[PDB]
Scaffold this active site. Structure first.
Site, short mmCIF file in Angstrom:
data_model
loop_
_atom_site.label_atom_id
_atom_site.label_comp_id
_atom_site.label_asym_id
_atom_site.label_seq_id
_atom_site.Cartn_x
_atom_site.Cartn_y
_atom_site.Cartn_z
N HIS A 266 0.83 -1.12 -0.07
CA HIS A 266 0.04 0.08 0.06
C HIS A 266 0.90 1.22 -0.16
O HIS A 266 0.32 2.13 0.09
CB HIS A 266 -0.83 -0.03 1.21
CG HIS A 266 -0.50 0.45 2.76
ND1 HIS A 266 -0.25 -0.48 3.54
CD2 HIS A 266 -0.34 1.71 2.97
CE1 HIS A 266 0.04 0.21 4.76
NE2 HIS A 266 0.13 1.47 4.25
N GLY B 24 3.25 6.87 10.01
CA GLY B 24 4.79 6.40 9.38
C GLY B 24 5.04 5.06 10.06
O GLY B 24 6.44 4.87 9.66
N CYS C 11 4.22 1.92 9.62
CA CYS C 11 4.08 0.76 8.71
C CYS C 11 5.35 0.52 7.89
O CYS C 11 6.17 1.32 7.88
CB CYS C 11 2.93 1.23 7.47
SG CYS C 11 1.08 1.55 7.89
#
Ligand SMILES: *[C@](O)(C(=O)NCc1ccccc1)[C@H](C[C@@H]1CCNC1=O)NC(=O)[C@H](CC1CC1)n1cccc(NC(=O)OC(C)(C)C)c1=O
Ligand SMILES: *[C@](O)(C(=O)NCc1ccccc1)[C@H](C[C@@H]1CCNC1=O)NC(=O)[C@H](CC1CC1)n1cccc(NC(=O)OC(C)(C)C)c1=O
Ligand SMILES: [Cl-]
Lengths: 302, 301
Positions: free
Chosen positions: A41, A143, A145
């Site tokens: 993603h 941030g 991820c």
């Protein structure tokens, strides 16, 4: 003293964290050999996020779209390939700090250490558990991820989690490192919910064993119950069923304390029915369920 | 969502841990540049422990009495000094993994990470606080001495603790990296004991402000309080006095939430009166005092 949640030393994983940027989306990547693993993603623009088609979104992107940064070094991308919900970026440079590692998939109840990172830069580490509802209690901000979870066994890092999203109730969901979700979640902007969590019965008993070993013994009793009888009461208080596998896995802690698992269950039955009745166990007013038998045998016995 | 008990990444400290052996005594040491810092009681036998004369035991040692091992590589001791309760072993090889660092003496109520080590091998990382009675809570076993506590603010490692000993209640005592004990303790097996442990009030309030910023207000009430009236109540629950400094310190968490710190004190007073009634604050059913005002601002954006 509290019998403390211990995280694995994180240095072997710290040398693997890079920043991955694709347009205006920045998150964390795992640099092992000449491949960078990160959530797929990162390719999504924001309009795409609603209902994305990833296969046709990736064909469209090309190598030079992915800016990868290891500290102040730019890694050049020379390949990209999707695997379920993770993106594999082939880079020009093998990670000189690549540890011995494998990719594994953990079961609910099993614990691991998470290295929270922002902009490819490690921020903190904490111990947590794959909940029965396949979520993790934690603290991830924007941030986070691409942050990974792992176990260390000798010199071998077992990577078991990559962070993807926040849910309602401030709990979290991600994949194994082959991009398969833990639990019934998808990588879209959409209404998703964890659904009812349960307590990890085998871990609770392990933590009562840890207590007995550190001299906290007031909840012990003369009674023994049976699996069927215990599972009737477990089912009632939102407690995972206890299986003959669980009984076997607790065998060591049973013999090392003289408390048969089904005696300790009678103890736990009585704590579920009557409560803590004013007292604590290892300084906690709740029954802790995020230490495994192995964790208790490691940190404590050993 | 996010305000949970987090340790620093231990990597910069892992590359400094070594094993120090003197006779039958083995413990951990910390290798920065060309010096290895460890507890001086490495030079004691099980016998010297009651009344060791450290100056007398040390004058009888030569550099080659000290076996220092960085994994398989043996380091060569070419010098030795004693500073307070820490031994400094000069070695012939600077540590090439030496990070940017400083030594700092912390005040009680401050938090830090501990890299627990056995035989120079890191085992685990955990976050804790200097209790007001200058002890530490957790789990060190035989092998853990010379394990260190640290903070990492912007790549600089601040070493603030080295582990030395256990006290009867199963709490832990140790020194700064200049060998001065936190508290009134001595590296000696004489029956000494910790002053009574109080709750770090400034830390609990920080955590109540954290619960609010994360959108949880159930514990708030309409009352305010005087500082003096707050301490009169809080002492009855063995809470540390709150000072003007603690109130100045909480300023930014107040302004950020628009709850004045004496209004938050009012909530805490009522929390202490009522208990939780089976509710929870950021996941816990006891009040959490090992998160500092600074820790709250860092884990909020
Ligand atoms: C992750 O994508 C990430 O860090 N991306 C980089 C980035 C995002 C935002 C700003 C700067 C940089 C985040 C991590 C999240 C955000 C905050 N806490 C986390 O753990 N994940 C998402 O944004 C995630 C992406 C989805 C899977 C593909 N996402 C999207 C939409 C909604 C949510 N959750 C959400 O709104 O949660 C509640 C609790 C309902 C508010 C979500 O996680
Ligand atoms: C420290 O030196 C250590 O790590 N030992 C090295 C080692 C021993 C055996 C095998 C391999 C390596 C220990 C750490 C302590 C002991 C257990 N828990 C700890 O945190 N330090 C001491 O043992 C210490 C040395 C004293 C200061 C000079 N010491 C000695 C004797 C008694 C105690 N305390 C004690 O008995 O604790 C109670 C709670 C009373 C049981 C002690 O800390
Ligand atoms: Cl609790």
């Amino acid at each position: 003293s509290g019998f403390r949640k211990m995280a694995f030393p994180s240095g072997k994983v710290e040398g693997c964290m890079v920043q991955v940027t694709c347009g205006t989306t920045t998150l964390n990547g795992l640099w092992l050999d000449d491949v960078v693993y990160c959530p797929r993603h990162v390719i999504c623009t924001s309009e795409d996020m609603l209902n994305p088609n990833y296969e046709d979104l990736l064909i469209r992107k090309s190598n030079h779209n992915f800016l990868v940064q290891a500290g102040n070094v730019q890694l050049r991308v020379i390949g990209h390939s999707m695997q379920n919900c993770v993106l594999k970026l082939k880079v020009d440079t093998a990670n000189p700090k690549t540890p011995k590692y494998k990719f594994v998939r953990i079961q609910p109840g099993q614990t691991f250490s998470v290295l929270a990172c922002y902009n490819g830069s490690p921020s903190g580490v904490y111990q947590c558990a794959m909940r029965p509802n396949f979520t993790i209690k934690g603290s991830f901000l924007n941030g986070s991820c691409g942050s990974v979870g792992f176990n260390i066994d000798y010199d071998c890092v077992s990577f078991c989690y990559m962070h993807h999203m926040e849910l309602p109730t401030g709990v979290y969901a991600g994949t194994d490192l082959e991009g398969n979700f833990y639990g019934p979640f998808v990588d879209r902007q959409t209404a998703q919910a964890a659904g009812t969590d349960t307590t990890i019965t085998v871990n609770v008993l392990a933590w009562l064993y840890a207590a007995v070993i550190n001299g906290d013994r007031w909840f012990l009793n003369r009674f023994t119950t049976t699996l069927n009888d215990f599972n009737l009461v477990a089912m009632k208080y939102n407690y995972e069923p206890l299986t003959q596998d669980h009984v076997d896995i607790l065998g060591p802690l049973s013999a090392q304390t003289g408390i048969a698992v089904l005696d300790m269950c009678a103890s736990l039955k009585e704590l579920l029915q009557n409560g803590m009745n004013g007292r604590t166990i290892l300084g906690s007013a709740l029954l802790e369920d995020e230490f495994t038998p192995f964790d208790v045998v490691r940190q404590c016995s050993g």
